[PDB]
Amino acid sequence: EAVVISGRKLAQQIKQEVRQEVEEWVASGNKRPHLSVILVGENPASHSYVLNKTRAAAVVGINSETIMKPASISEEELLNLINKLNNDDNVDGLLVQLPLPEHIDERRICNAVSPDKDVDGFHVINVGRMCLDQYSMLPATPWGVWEIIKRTGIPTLGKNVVVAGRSKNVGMPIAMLLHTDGAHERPGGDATVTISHRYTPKEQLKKHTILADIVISAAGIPNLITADMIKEGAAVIDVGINRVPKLVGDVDFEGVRQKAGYITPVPGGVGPMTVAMLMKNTIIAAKKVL
Amino acid sequence: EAVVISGRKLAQQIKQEVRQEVEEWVASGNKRPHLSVILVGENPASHSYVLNKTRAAAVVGINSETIMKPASISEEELLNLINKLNNDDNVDGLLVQLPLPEHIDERRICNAVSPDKDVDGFHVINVGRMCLDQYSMLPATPWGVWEIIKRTGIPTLGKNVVVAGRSKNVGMPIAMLLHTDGAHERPGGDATVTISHRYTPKEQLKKHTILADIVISAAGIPNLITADMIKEGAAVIDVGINRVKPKLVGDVDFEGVRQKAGYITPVPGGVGPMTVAMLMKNTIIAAKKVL
Ligand SMILES: Cc1cc(C(=O)N[C@@H](CCC(=O)O)C(=O)O)ccc1NC(=O)Nc1c(N)nc(N)[nH]c1=O
Numbered sequence: 122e123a124v125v126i127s128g129r130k131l132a133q134q135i136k137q138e139v140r141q142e143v144e145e146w147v148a149s150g151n152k153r154p155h156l157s158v159i160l161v162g163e164n165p166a167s168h169s170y171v172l173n174k175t176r177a178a179a180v181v182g183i184n185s186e187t188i189m190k191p192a193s194i195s196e197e198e199l200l201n202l203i204n205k206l207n208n209d210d211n212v213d214g215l216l217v218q219l220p221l222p223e224h225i226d227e228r229r230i231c232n233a234v235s236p237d238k239d240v241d242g243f244h245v246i247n248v249g250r251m252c253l254d255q256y257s258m259l260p261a262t263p264w265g266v267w268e269i270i271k272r273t274g275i276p277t278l279g280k281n282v283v284v285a286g287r288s289k290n291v292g293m294p295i296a297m298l299l300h301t302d303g304a305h306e307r308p309g310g311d312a313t314v315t316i317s318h319r320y321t322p323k324e325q326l327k328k329h330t331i332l333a334d335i336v337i338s339a340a341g342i343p344n345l346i347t348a349d350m351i352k353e354g355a356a357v358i359d360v361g362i363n364r365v366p367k368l369v370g371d372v373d374f375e376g377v378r379q380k381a382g383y384i385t386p387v388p389g390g391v392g393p394m395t396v397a398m399l400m401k402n403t404i405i406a407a408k409k410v411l
Numbered sequence: 412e413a414v415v416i417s418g419r420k421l422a423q424q425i426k427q428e429v430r431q432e433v434e435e436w437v438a439s440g441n442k443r444p445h446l447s448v449i450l451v452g453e454n455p456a457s458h459s460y461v462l463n464k465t466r467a468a469a470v471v472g473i474n475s476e477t478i479m480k481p482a483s484i485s486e487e488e489l490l491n492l493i494n495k496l497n498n499d500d501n502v503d504g505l506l507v508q509l510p511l512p513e514h515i516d517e518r519r520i521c522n523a524v525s526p527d528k529d530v531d532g533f534h535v536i537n538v539g540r541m542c543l544d545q546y547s548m549l550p551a552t553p554w555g556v557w558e559i560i561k562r563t564g565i566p567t568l569g570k571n572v573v574v575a576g577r578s579k580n581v582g583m584p585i586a587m588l589l590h591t592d593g594a595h596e597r598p599g600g601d602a603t604v605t606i607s608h609r610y611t612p613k614e615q616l617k618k619h620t621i622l623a624d625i626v627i628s629a630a631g632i633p634n635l636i637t638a639d640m641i642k643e644g645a646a647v648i649d650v651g652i653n654r655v656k657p658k659l660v661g662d663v664d665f666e667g668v669r670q671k672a673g674y675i676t677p678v679p680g681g682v683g684p685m686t687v688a689m690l691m692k693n694t695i696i697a698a699k700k701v702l
């Protein structure tokens with residue numbers, strides 16, 4: 122039967138590392154880290170995820186504030202607010218929660234956060250440095266998927282991996298982290314990564330996943346990963362979070378639970394790892410390590 | 412037998428289009444374009460390739476110069492020279508031929524080239540924008556691989572593609588272009604892409620290539636790709652150039668794969684000349700200050 126990897130317990134340890142690093146940093150004379158979160162509108166999942174992020178900040182010793190603005194805000198007003206925070210010497214990390222209303226250019230907003238405060242890793246310089254295997258702020262969900270793999274001890278070097286999805290914030294960074302060189306400034310997993318997306322016929326997904334030692338699902342389709350697509354003993358990691366009055370991942374949990382070696386549940390899987398790795402990035406930003 | 416795609420022929424066509432675009436740019440009352448290539452050291456492959464670039468410049472009506480420096484120059488001296496050329500209004504495109512000596516940080520050098528003169532697409536901003544499917548200077552060899560595919564009508568949407576190699580200048584951009592969305596600012600191929608590299612076990616590589624409608628080899632390994640790894644009718648594009656009496660071959664077993672592939676590029680006369688052609692396109696793009 123498949124080990125159900127506990128995302129809640131792993132994030133507990135990571136957060137414990139952070140609250141210790143933060144306390145050593147404060148004890149030796151430095152400012153306590155501060156994270157600002159800008160939240161636009163009333164997406165219930167957004168508010169819920171921002172709340173998780175600020176609860177986690179408080180219990181690791183990081184100060185935080187959530188600036189909530191109505192969905193009717195103009196792009197120029199958001200860019201003013203971003204620029205004021207970029208110049209607030211108290212603020213170490215600044216992130217704008219996505220998605221943003223249709224009339225606001227998301228990519229303009231992301232590049233307007235100064236890269237030293239860009240704990241999300243969404244600024245184009247952070248994306249480019251990540252893609253060159255340089256030291257960077259790693260985006261939180263891809264770094265969480267990576268930490269799930271590394272702390273569970275699942276090998277990646279020379280192994281086959283399939284990512285479902287190519288979004289610039291989740292799927293593509295996961296694929297980048299997993300195929301790249303262990304020896305580089307920012308190490309990678311040295312795996313053999315296949316990238317599928319909305320134009321991958323399901324038949325051809327199955328022919329690649331049966332070869333996969335690690336299937337990573339970040340598409341947002343319920344029941345996309347089913348037991349006949351996974352080989353015996355493979356690790357399956359569910360980034361998708363779907364509402365079907367219930368919440369489920371992209372994997373068919375019960376069926377793949379029999380077939381797989383490892384699996385991550387939804388909720389309680391990658392979710393709390395996203396919040397944990399954002400805490401790492403905030404203290405990294407407070408140190409001006411980069 | 413397989414259709415052999417002549418990269419030499421396609422590149423000379425494209426050079427012709429660039430030439431017409433330059434003459435019109437000049438006839439409209441604009442400065443003739445100028446490309447500067449910086450060459451460090453005496454790698455003979457590097458010298459041969461820069462010579463091919465400056466020849467193509469002359470053919471398409473672009474002024475050029477190669478500035479050769481000994482390998483013993485310092486990083487600071489290269490940056491002084493690069494800053495000089497960034498500030499020369501006569502200079503439209505500027506590239507530093509890779510690889511550089513171990514004491515020169517390649518990353519710092521590529522980021523030192525003004526992004527508007529960055530005809531290699533190597534500046535971290537161009538890399539970042541390419542990886543977000545924004546408009547950017549595409550690097551030359553990946554763009555040549557893309558043109559070979561598109562100008563031959565070889566379809567990519569929903570197809571399986573395997574890239575052998577993951578270098579930031581060649582294999583990674585090729586895999587980024589091929590797997591990304593046709594509907595974004597800079598369109599992608601919408602393919603299903605597998606990236607293999609030096610730790611991919613040869614038997615596992617084979618288990619992917621057999622599903623592949625396109626195989627692209629940028630590993631630098633003679634006879635890496637052999638006819639039993641390829642499915643029938645597939646396209647096989649040989650990015651590698653290996654020296655193996657001295658002879659030049661690709662990563663692909665040309666004669667063997669010739670029999671099962673639907674398409675194939677030769678080495679030499681394949682991707683190489685396409686690299687030089689797309690650099691001419693990027694230089695007229697840079698001269699026009701379009702990005
Ligand atoms: C998907 C997700 C879930 C959770 C979470 O808390 N998941 C729990 C369920 C708890 C519940 O059900 O409420 C679980 O899965 O266990 C936290 C975070 C994210 N993802 C993001 O936050 N992405 C993101 C973004 N949208 N914008 C910016 N700027 N940066 C970002 O990283």
Ligand SMILES: Cc1cc(C(=O)N[C@@H](CCC(=O)O)C(=O)O)ccc1NC(=O)Nc1c(N)nc(N)[nH]c1=O
Nearest residue numbers: 459460463506507508509551679680681683684686
């Ligand atoms: C690999 C290659 C081959 C040829 C070529 O002429 N091939 C012919 C004959 C080969 C021969 O004459 O031996 C053929 O394949 O037939 C031209 C160009 C490159 N590649 C590069 O130049 N890459 C590159 C780089 N190294 N540094 C910077 N800054 N920018 C770059 O784009």
